[PDB]
Design a protein around this ligand. Sequence first.
Ligand code: PUG
Ligand code: PUG
Ligand code: PUG
Ligand code: PUG
Ligand code: PUG
Ligand code: K
Ligand code: K
Ligand code: K
Ligand code: K
Ligand code: K
Ligand code: K
Ligand code: K
Ligand code: K
Ligand code: K
Lengths: 146, 147, 146, 147, 147
Amino acid sequence: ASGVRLAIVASSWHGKICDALLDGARKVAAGCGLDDPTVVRVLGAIEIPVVAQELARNHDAVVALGVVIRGQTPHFDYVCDAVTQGLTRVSLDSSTPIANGVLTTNTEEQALDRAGLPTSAEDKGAQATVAALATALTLRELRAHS
Amino acid sequence: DASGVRLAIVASSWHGKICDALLDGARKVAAGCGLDDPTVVRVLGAIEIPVVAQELARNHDAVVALGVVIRGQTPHFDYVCDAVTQGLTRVSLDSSTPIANGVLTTNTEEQALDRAGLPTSAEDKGAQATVAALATALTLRELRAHS
Amino acid sequence: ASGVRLAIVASSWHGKICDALLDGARKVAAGCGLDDPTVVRVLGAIEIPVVAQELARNHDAVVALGVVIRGQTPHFDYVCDAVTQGLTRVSLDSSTPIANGVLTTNTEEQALDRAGLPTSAEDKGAQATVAALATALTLRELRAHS
Amino acid sequence: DASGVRLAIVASSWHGKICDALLDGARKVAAGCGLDDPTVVRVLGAIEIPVVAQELARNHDAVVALGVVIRGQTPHFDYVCDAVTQGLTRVSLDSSTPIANGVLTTNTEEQALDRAGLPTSAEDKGAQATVAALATALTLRELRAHS
Amino acid sequence: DASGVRLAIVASSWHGKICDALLDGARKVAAGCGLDDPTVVRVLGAIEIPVVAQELARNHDAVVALGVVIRGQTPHFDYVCDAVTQGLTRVSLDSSTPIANGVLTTNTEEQALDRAGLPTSAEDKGAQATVAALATALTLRELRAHS
Ligand SMILES: O=c1[nH]c(=O)c2[nH]c(=O)n(C[C@@H](O)[C@H](O)[C@H](O)CO)c2[nH]1
Ligand SMILES: O=c1[nH]c(=O)c2[nH]c(=O)n(C[C@@H](O)[C@H](O)[C@H](O)CO)c2[nH]1
Ligand SMILES: O=c1[nH]c(=O)c2[nH]c(=O)n(C[C@@H](O)[C@H](O)[C@H](O)CO)c2[nH]1
Ligand SMILES: O=c1[nH]c(=O)c2[nH]c(=O)n(C[C@@H](O)[C@H](O)[C@H](O)CO)c2[nH]1
Ligand SMILES: O=c1[nH]c(=O)c2[nH]c(=O)n(C[C@@H](O)[C@H](O)[C@H](O)CO)c2[nH]1
Ligand SMILES: [K+]
Ligand SMILES: [K+]
Ligand SMILES: [K+]
Ligand SMILES: [K+]
Ligand SMILES: [K+]
Ligand SMILES: [K+]
Ligand SMILES: [K+]
Ligand SMILES: [K+]
Ligand SMILES: [K+]
C-alpha cells in the first residue's frame, strides 16, 4: 500500500475523543508505508461530506472521523442521518472509498471505549483507515492497467 | 478572521421569539468575524428553507439556516424535520457550498428557549451554526485553487 | 401578489377533510388578488409528487393538500416517507417552492381539527398557501430584474 | 374510454398466495377500464422491483408495483421497505411516469391476507393501486401538450 | 441454463466464519447454473460494498452483495444498515443492473448463523441472493433488444 494517496478529515466537537481517533488513523498509515497523508479538520459532523467531496478529486481514499453523543432532544437522529446520506453520495459520485469512522453512542464512556485510548477496548479510527486502504488497492487491481 | 467571505442567513418565522433569538446570535458572530452586513432572508416555515437556500448558494460562499420545530401531538414533527435533513444535504453537494443546519428540534418549548441564546440560556445553536459555516468556507478556499 | 401563477394539487383520500383544506386555500388565494388558481385533483398522496413536477413547469408556486391517518399497520410511515422525499426533490429540481399542506395525524378527530371547519382550532390549508405565495414573492425580489 | 393508456405491472414472488391475489385485482381493473392485455413481469423479491420498473417506464404511460413484506424477528423488515420506498420514488420522477405503490407492509400474515382481495377480505390494495396509476396517467395526458 | 450471464460477487470480511458460509452457498448456485468461474472480490466492511459493486457493474450482467451486520450496544447498527440500503439501490438504477442484497442484519450472533447456510442452519441467504441476481438478469435480457 505504498503507492496509494490517502486523505483524512476529522471533526472537532468533543476534542479529546477526536484526537484519539486521528491518532489511530495516522499510525495505521505510517505502518502501511504512507508517510504524511492529507489531514483536514472541521468543526462538526455535518460539515464533513462537503470537504470529502473536494478531497476525492485528488486522492485514492478518504477517511472521515467524528463523534456524536445522544443528548435529551431528538437532535442526535438528524446529525447522524446527514453523515449517512452525505458520505454515501460522495463515495458513488467520485468512485472512491469513503470510510465512515464517525462514532454514534448513547453515553460518553462508550465513545471513549471505541477511540483507542490507553484503557479502551477498541479503536474504530484504526479500523476505518484499514477499510479505506484495502478498498483502494482492490479497485486498482480491478481497473485498467498493464 | 473571515473578512473575505460572502455569507447568507435564512430564518423561518414559526415561533417569533426563538427565531429572533437565533438570528441575533448568528448576526453577532458574523460581525465579530469581520462581516458587517450579510444577506438575511425571512420565510414562513422550515420546509421553505431548502428552496430559498438553493437560490442563495449561487451567489454566496456560506449559507446558514435557522428555525424551530417543536413536537406536537401528531407525528407531524418527524416529517417536517426529515424534509430539512434531505433538503439541506442535497443543496450542499449540488453547489459544493457549506450549508449550516441551525434549525432546532425539541420536545418541549423550554428546551427550545434554553438553546436559543437568550439572557438565561444554557447555549446558543444559532451562533454555533454560523461558526460552522464560516470555518468550512475558509477551509475549502485553502484546499481549492490559488496562485 | 396578483402577478403570481398559483397551482394547487389536492388528494381525494378522506374526502370531507380534503374539501375543507381546498376551500381554505381558495379563500386566501382570492383574498390576495388571485381569483382563479390551477386546481388539480389526485386520488392518493403518493401521486402528488409526479403531478406537482408537471405543474412546476409553468407556475410560480405549488400547494399540495392531503390527509394521511395512522392505522393498525406500519403503512402510515411509508406513505409519509414517499411524500416527504418527492416534494423535496420536486422543489429543488425546478427551483419552485412546493408547499407541504398534507396533514399527518394519529386519530381522525385531530385531522378534522386542523382542517378549518366551523369549530376547528386552525386551518393548515390556508397556512400552506400563504407559505407558497410569500416564498414565490421572495424569490421574485431576489432574482433578475430590472 | 380510458383505453389509450399503455400499462405495465410488475409483481414479486415472495409469498405465493397473496401476490397472485394482488395481481388478480390489478388485472380486473385494467380490463374494466378498456385495457385487455397489459405488460406483466414477475420478479423474485421486492428489492428487484425498482430496476424492472425503470425498464418498463421507457415505453409505458403507467407502472404498477405489487408485493408483500411481512415482519419477522430481525429488523430486516425495516430495510426491505426502505429500498422499495426509495427506489420507486426515484423512478417516478426520473421518467415523469406514475409508479403505483401496491406493496403491502404488515405485522402479521392475517393482516396481509385481509388487504389482498381474497373471497373474505376487508379490502383490495391491488385494485386501488391500478386505479391510482390509470387516473394519474389520464390527468398528465390532459395537462401536457395536445393540439 | 444461465451459462451466458456474467456474474460478480462481492463479500465483506467482518465476522469471518459467516462470510465464508455466505460465499460458499453463492458459489454453489453459480456452479449449478452453468457458471464455473465468477468474479469474486473481498472487502473489509459492509459500507465498502457499494463502491466495489459500482466498478463490477461496468463489466457484468449481475452483482451479488454478501455480509453480516450484528447489533451492538450503540445505535451504530441502524447507520451501517442505512448506508448499505441507500448505496445499493442507487447503484442498481444508475447502471440498470440487478444488485442482490445478501447482507444479513441480525440481533444475535446465533440468528446470523442460522441464515448463513451452515450444516445445521435453517436457511442459506447467500444462495437466495444469487438466484435473485441471475433470474433478474435473464429477465432484463428477454425484455431488452434482440434480433
Ligand atoms: O460488515 C460490518 N458488520 C458490522 O457488524 C460492523 N460494525 C462495524 O462497525 N462495521 C464497520 C464497517 O461497516 C466499515 O468498515 C466502516 O464503518 C467504514 O469506515 C461493520 N461492518
Ligand atoms: O460532531 C458533532 N457531534 C455532536 O454531538 C453534535 N451536536 C451538534 O449539535 N453538533 C453540531 C453539528 O452537527 C453541526 O456543525 C451543526 O448542526 C451546525 O450545522 C454536533 N457535532
Ligand atoms: O392520501 C392517502 N392517505 C392515506 O391515509 C393512505 N393510505 C393509503 O394506503 N393510501 C394509498 C395512496 O397513498 C396510494 O394511492 C397507494 O400507495 C397506491 O400507489 C393513502 N393515501
Ligand atoms: O418552523 C416550523 N416549525 C414547526 O413546528 C411547524 N409545524 C408546521 O406545520 N410548520 C409549517 C411549515 O413546515 C411549512 O410552512 C408548512 O408545512 C407549509 O408547507 C412548521 N414550521
Ligand atoms: O418480497 C419480499 N418480501 C419479504 O418480506 C422479503 N424478505 C426478504 O429477505 N426478501 C428478499 C428480497 O428482498 C431480495 O430478493 C433479496 O434481498 C435479494 O436481493 C423479501 N422479499
Ligand atoms: K479519486
Ligand atoms: K483489471
Ligand atoms: K457558491
Ligand atoms: K491548493
Ligand atoms: K416554475
Ligand atoms: K436582484
Ligand atoms: K413514460
Ligand atoms: K395542456
Ligand atoms: K452492466
